[PDB]
Amino acid sequence: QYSSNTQQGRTSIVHLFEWRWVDIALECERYLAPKGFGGVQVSPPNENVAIHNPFRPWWERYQPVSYKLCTRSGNEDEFRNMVTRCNNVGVRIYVDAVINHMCGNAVSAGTSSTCGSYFNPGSRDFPAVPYSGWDFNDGKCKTGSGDIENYNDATQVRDCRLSGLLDLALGKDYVRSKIAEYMNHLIDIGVAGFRIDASKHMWPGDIKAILDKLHNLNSNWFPEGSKPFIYQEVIDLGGEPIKSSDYFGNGRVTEFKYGAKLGTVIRKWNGEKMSYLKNWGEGWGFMPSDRALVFVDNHDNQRGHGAGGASILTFWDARLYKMAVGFMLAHPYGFTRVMSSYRWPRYFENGKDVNDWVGPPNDNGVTKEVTINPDTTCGNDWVCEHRWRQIRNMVNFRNVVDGQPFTNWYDNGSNQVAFGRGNRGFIVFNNDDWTFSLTLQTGLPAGTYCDVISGDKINGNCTGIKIYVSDDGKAHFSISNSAEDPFIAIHAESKL
């Protein structure tokens, strides 16, 4: 469950947050495949509650109603079409599996679901599964509210309701079975793995019992006996009874400490500096690299939710964001996930963004299609960070240097750092308040290399900066602290 199942030479997955199945299919063929992306993390494909107040929030997708593949992203036919098309071009699909719970216990009974399924939270009635009151942890929880009240108690964290969401009795084989049913349907369609939502709220043992029941990957695209890639969402910033290491037997685990710290360093908070990154990874208290799923931001925390609070870098902080993503893609630690967002009318009613609930770009609830601009960016309020030249090019940088050691580290003891990846890549950063101008030892063979930050390599020439590496492998770098993109990156495949 630790291997991504991506093609050889494709080292990252992109989260296409709330995208429609039809758009993802197109994206796989017109961009992801040819630009070297390894896979896509999709939003929950199962039927959820349609919340009308506030109006169709993004988080309604984390409140399941059934396991029918019918959401704002599309129906089963479209989902199947998407997986097939992406797989045919070597781009994998990873499903966001919401299995800890069903909907809010105070939601109202009826058919206000994305597929019209009837459900009654008050009675714990989910006929479309089906689930009854005998399938929820109500009796198992021991809190006065039946909700999670204290994170120092491992048992309530897992047996009580997360903010009122009906907590499934994962201890029962029936429930584990229904879930496996759902997950197997997806595997047979062609999904390469899963993001297990709210793993912190489940017992490692229950998760295990579910994985036990899963099929191997679809033998049309995956060699016989392949296991689904598993990455568990466990928010662990330390000092809690529940530890991310508790989940290592099930697969990888989200390393939230990564983005929190990268965010603090780049924002130069708490007297942190880039030169401190010289021992980035385990050296900073992180989980083993072979179990980490890393990212700068996610859907929760780009909204000041998740974990990291105010330090998290996002598309809103574009210049610094590109730097952080760049550093992540160049550094050997973990399996990387790139975020792809949508713009929302962020509005601070002093302190808090009161619109952090707003769902994807829509017309009366119907998700808007992803349009492409002439400059290869996206319209209809889709941010498409994965299409930003600097990010897209760093995804390819990672592919090219995969497996190379961390070498030729340099720092000015402040915020000017550089490092190479064997003899296949070199990156330079200037996050100080003055120009960086120094001749560095790169570890790269002589020649003219296109900087992939300021431009591209287009057969025979560079459209941005050119770096000349001398036969002694030295190159001169000059980066103004005022540059749009205060970093340079060259690699074996950007060489003329």
Q: Is 233 a catalytic residue?
A: yes
Q: Which stretch binds Ca ion (CB under 5 A): 82-90, 193-201, 249-257, 260-268?
A: 193-201
Partner from Cl ion, Ca ion, none binding residue 233, C-beta < 5-8 Å depending on class: Cl ion
CA distance to 68, 184, 238, 252, 272, per residue, from 75 (Å): 9, 17, 40, 29, 47
| Least Å from the CB of residue 51 to Ca ion | 21
Q: How many CA atoms lie within 13 A of 201 on its CB side?
A: 23
One character per residue 78-117, x = contact with Ca ion (rule: CB under 5 A) = ----------------------x-----------------
Q: How far apart are CA 253 and CA 259, in angstroms?
A: 14
Task: Read off the DSSP letter of residue 369.
Answer: P
Q: Which two tokens stand for residue 478?
A: 């000059």
| Minimum CB distance to Ca ion smaller for 201 or for 457 | 201
Partner from Ca ion, Cl ion, none binding residue 236, C-beta < 5-8 Å depending on class: none
Partner from Cl ion, Ca ion, none binding residue 167, C-beta < 5-8 Å depending on class: Ca ion
Asked if 450 and 464 touch (Cβ cutoff 8 Å), the reply is yes
Q: How far apart are CA 330 and CA 327, in angstroms?
A: 5
**Is there a binding annotation on residue 100?**
yes
Q: Which stretch binds Cl ion (CB under 5 A): 247-255, 265-273, 276-284, 419-427?
A: 247-255
| Minimum CB distance to Ca ion smaller for 96 or for 167 | 167
Q: Output the DSSP codes for 216-270.
A: PPPTTTS-TT---EEEE-----SSSSS-GGGGTTTSEEE-HHHHHHHHHHHTT-T
| Minimum CB distance to Ca ion smaller for 102 or for 488 | 102
Partner from Ca ion, Cl ion, none binding residue 298, C-beta < 5-8 Å depending on class: Cl ion
Q: How far apart are CA 151 and CA 79, in angstroms?
A: 37
Q: How far apart are CA 125 and CA 91, in angstroms?
A: 38
CA distance to 24, 46, 360, 373, 474, per residue, from 370 (Å): 9, 21, 11, 10, 44
One character per residue 237-276, x = contact with Ca ion (rule: CB under 5 A) = ----------------------------------------
| Least Å from the CB of residue 442 to Cl ion | 35
Q: Is there binding between residue 272 and Cl ion (CB under 5 A)? A: no
Partner from Cl ion, Ca ion, none binding residue 387, C-beta < 5-8 Å depending on class: none
Task: Read off the DSSP letter of residue 296.
Answer: S
Give the CB-nearest residue to Cl ion.
Answer: 298
Nearest to 202 by CA among 245, 171, 174, 165: 171
Residues 6+ apart with CB under 8 A from 442: 408, 420, 426, 469, 473, 474, 475, 490
| Least Å from the CB of residue 37 to Cl ion | 18
Q: Is there binding between residue 233 and Cl ion (CB under 5 A)? A: yes
**Is there a binding annotation on residue 432?**
no
User: Token match 């760049």: residue?
Assistant: 326
Q: Is there binding between residue 389 and Ca ion (CB under 5 A)? A: no
**Is there a binding annotation on residue 461?**
no
**Is there a binding annotation on residue 92?**
no
Q: Which two tokens stand for residue 234?
A: 């466990």
Q: How many CA atoms lie within 13 A of 287 on its CB side?
A: 26
Q: Is there binding between residue 298 and Cl ion (CB under 5 A)? A: yes
Q: Is 212 a catalytic residue?
A: no
**Is there a binding annotation on residue 124?**
no
Q: Which two tokens stand for residue 316?
A: 């809103």
**Is there a binding annotation on residue 201?**
yes
Q: Give the number of other CB atoms < 10 A from CB of residue 343.
A: 13
| Least Å from the CB of residue 262 to Cl ion | 15
One character per residue 144-163, x = contact with Ca ion (rule: CB under 5 A) = --------------x-----
| Least Å from the CB of residue 159 to Ca ion | 6
**Is there a binding annotation on residue 125?**
no
| Least Å from the CB of residue 231 to Cl ion | 8
CA 232 to chain centroid, in Å, comes to 11
Q: Which stretch binds Ca ion (CB under 5 A): 165-173, 384-392, 410-418, 419-427?
A: 165-173
Q: Which residue from 27, 96, 167, 451 is in contact with Ca ion, where contact means CB under 5 A?
A: 167
Q: Is there binding between residue 176 and Ca ion (CB under 5 A)? A: no
State phi, psi for 64 to the nearest 5 degrees: -60, 150
Q: Which two tokens stand for residue 480?
A: 């103004």
Residues shown for the chain: 496
Catalytic-labelled residue, pool 78, 233, 356, 385: 233
State phi, psi for 85 to the nearest 5 degrees: -65, -45
Q: How far apart are CA 395 and CA 399, in angstroms?
A: 7
| Minimum CB distance to Cl ion smaller for 199 or for 430 | 199
Catalytic-labelled residue, pool 197, 297, 356, 432: 197
Q: Which residue from 195, 201, 273, 392 is in contact with Ca ion, where contact means CB under 5 A?
A: 201
Q: How far apart are CA 110 and CA 131, in angstroms?
A: 15
Contact residues for Cl ion, defined by CB under 5 A: 233, 254, 298
User: So which residues are the catalytic ones?
Assistant: 197, 233
Contact residues for Ca ion, defined by CB under 5 A: 100, 158, 167, 201
Binding residues for Ca(2+), by number, are 100, 158, 167, 201
Binding residues, by number, are 100, 158, 167, 195, 201, 298, 337
Binding residues for chloride, by number, are 195, 298, 337
